[PDB]
Amino acid sequence: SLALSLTADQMVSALLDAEPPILYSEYDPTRPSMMGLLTNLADRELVHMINWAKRVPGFVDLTSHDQVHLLECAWLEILMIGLVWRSMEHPGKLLFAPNLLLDRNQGMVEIFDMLLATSSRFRMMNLQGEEFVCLKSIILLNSGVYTFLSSTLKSLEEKDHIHRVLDKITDTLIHLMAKAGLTLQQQHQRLAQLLLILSHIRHMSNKGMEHLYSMVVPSYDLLLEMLDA
Amino acid sequence: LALSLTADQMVSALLDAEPPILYSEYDPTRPFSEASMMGLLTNLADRELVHMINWAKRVPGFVDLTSHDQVHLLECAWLEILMIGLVWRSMEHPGKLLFAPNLLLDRNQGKCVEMVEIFDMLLATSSRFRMMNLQGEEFVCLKSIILLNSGVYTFLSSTLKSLEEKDHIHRVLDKITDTLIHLMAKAGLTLQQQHQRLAQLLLILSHIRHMSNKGMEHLYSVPSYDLLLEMLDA
Ligand SMILES: COc1ccc(N(CC(F)(F)F)S(=O)(=O)[C@@H]2C[C@@H]3O[C@H]2C(c2ccc(OCCCN4CCCCC4)cc2)=C3c2ccc(O)cc2)cc1
Ligand SMILES: COc1ccc(N(CC(F)(F)F)S(=O)(=O)[C@@H]2C[C@@H]3O[C@H]2C(c2ccc(OCCCN4CCCCC4)cc2)=C3c2ccc(O)cc2)cc1
Questions:
Q1: For chain A, which terminal residue's Cβ has fewer other Cβ atoms within 10 angstroms, N or C?
Q2: So where does 17beta-estradiol get bound (chain B)?
């Protein structure tokens, strides 16, 4: 596997090159709904996410089935971390798209507040683009790894592979911090601080999901089809 | 005092603060029904909660926070703490959850649901801990991280006080991180292995959050603010 042979700098480069573009809401600036705009935006982001996933080093070494399970578990967290990153330089506001910039007053409010808090945390920490892409990849690989239903040798090799790629991403994060001039202590601390926020993103994704089942999630089969294509 | 602790004193303080393992209500009618399974687990959890508050009060830095912030952290973290305790106890019992020494359940007895899905996840966490050879000293660090980290991002914070509280939480979390690293360095791990193992332990916390959320979601009808406040004051 090419992925396990990458240096820190090549891992960063691969992830930066794979980044999807920032998409616009289909809001017509000449025409005078919220869920409609977000749904349409998310549906377009999802197509890019599948193609971005395929470019995350190590991801395509997995079976199609395991690729889908990871996307199933991670998709909402990935959209959410994207949103939080885009919003970082806009305190008090969520930048769903350049033409859909919302404050607290608008759009559940609970989930909004949590997204804003994550954004403030990223700002306070001076989160860098290179760090962002590492975290986004970690979410993809980590979110679904503990819930693989299979007991075959293959499933064991797949889990092991995921853990090895996650270790590479960890090495990458540490290398970026050492290059930026952080001491060893600061490196371990900052890595912990970044990984701990992932647990908040899991939470937000779960609450988002919970607030939905008062009323569509991409199915296994839909995701499998999108991967195959 | 908490920010002046060395790695070794932090470990010591956490080890000394560990709550006892409780027993489930003696001699329930077996086999279990949904109602009585939930009855036994609820009673067990309610008793564990009192000990958890006493344990929390001894986590270095926790009692420096306002009562209000102490409660908010326990509110967000309590189920994750019970869950990580269960996973730790179950580590040396593959395929089984050790709710208590006298309540050791295998997957088959999860099917008393609406349960089995969350059981499977708990078992997977237990196997992950086993495979990684998770040590007691590491466990107590992780459990403290959950307490301090789970509720820290959802402080409705405008005041300088709220900012100093959050800063304090982050400084104590940094100390726990240093502590975990020190334990790993002492155990003989290289620098690379140290960073990797720390990452692997912290990433499991995200799965424990998930299990806590799903547990909550599968609840078809939580310790109140007032209960938690009262237990802290006492
Ligand atoms: C269905 O899944 C959820 C889960 C939670 C919520 N939410 C409202 C709550 F149900 F919770 F009340 S939410 O958590 O607040 C969610 C976070 C943020 O706001 C919502 C939203 C958001 C809306 C709608 C959507 O549908 C797209 C999926 C529909 N498609 C998938 C497969 C093809 C056909 C159907 C996804 C995402 C956001 C978003 C958007 C973009 C972004 O780049 C970043 C963030 C809403 C929907
Ligand atoms: C039988 O039907 C199900 C259905 C699902 C599950 N669950 C999945 C499974 F665990 F079986 F795999 S579970 O819902 O996720 C939940 C996790 C675990 O089992 C339940 C339970 C649990 C019960 C109750 C409770 O407090 C109840 C209320 C507490 N008090 C608050 C204020 C005063 C009044 C009440 C907390 C916790 C557990 C526990 C318990 C202790 C522990 O040390 C570790 C774990 C289990 C059985």
A1: C
A2: 48, 89, 218
Q: B7 — contact with chain A (CB < 8 Å)?
A: no
The amino acid present at A204, given as its one-letter code, is: M
Q: Which of A14, A185, A200 is nearest to B195 (CA)?
A: A185
Instruction: Please indicate if any CB of chain B lies within 8 Å of the CB of A195.
Output: yes
Q: Is B28 in the pocket of ligand 2 (CB under 6 A)?
A: no
* Residues in chain B closer than 8 A to A118 (CB atoms): 153
DSSP for A5-59 reads: G--HHHHHHHHHHHPPPPPPP---TT---HHHHHHHHHHHHHHHHHHHHTTSTTG
Distance CA A153, CA A185 (A): 39
Find out whether the beta carbon of B86 lies less than 6 Å from any atom of ligand 2: yes
Domain-by-domain residue ranges, chain A? 1-229
Report the Cα–Cα distance between both ends of chain A, in Å, rounded.
23
Chain A residues touching residue B209 (CB < 8 angstroms): 199, 202-203, 206
Residue A203 CB coordination number (10 Å): 22
Count the residues in chain B.
Answer: 234
Resolution (A): 1.8
Atom of ligand 2 minimally distant from the CA of B214: 15
Tell me which long-range contacts B105-110 makes (C-beta under 8 A, separation of at least 24): B109/B32, B109/B37
- DSSP 3-state assignment of A69? helix
Q: Residue A169: how many CB atoms within 10 A of its CB?
A: 26
Question: To the nearest 10°, the Cα dihedral for B138, B142, B145, B150?
Answer: 170
B202·A195 Cβ contact <8 A: yes
Specify the 3-state DSSP secondary structure of A102: strand
Question: B1-234 sits in which CATH class?
Answer: mainly alpha
Token digits of residue A18: 């794979």
Tell me which residue of B203, B158, B172, B219 sits closest to B14, measured CA to CA: B172
Q: Which of B125, B174, B206 is opposite residue A198, by nearest beta carbon?
A: B206
**Structure determination method:** X-ray
CB contact under 8 A, A185 and B178: yes
CATH superfamily, region A1-229: Retinoid X Receptor (1.10.565.10)
Q: Which residues pair with A97 in a beta bridge?
A: A100
Check if the beta carbon of residue B125 is closer than 8 Å to that of residue B214.
Answer: no
Is residue B132 a contact partner of residue B54, using CB atoms and an 8 Å limit?
A: no
Compute the Cα dihedral for B206, A170, B9, B89 and give only its sign. positive
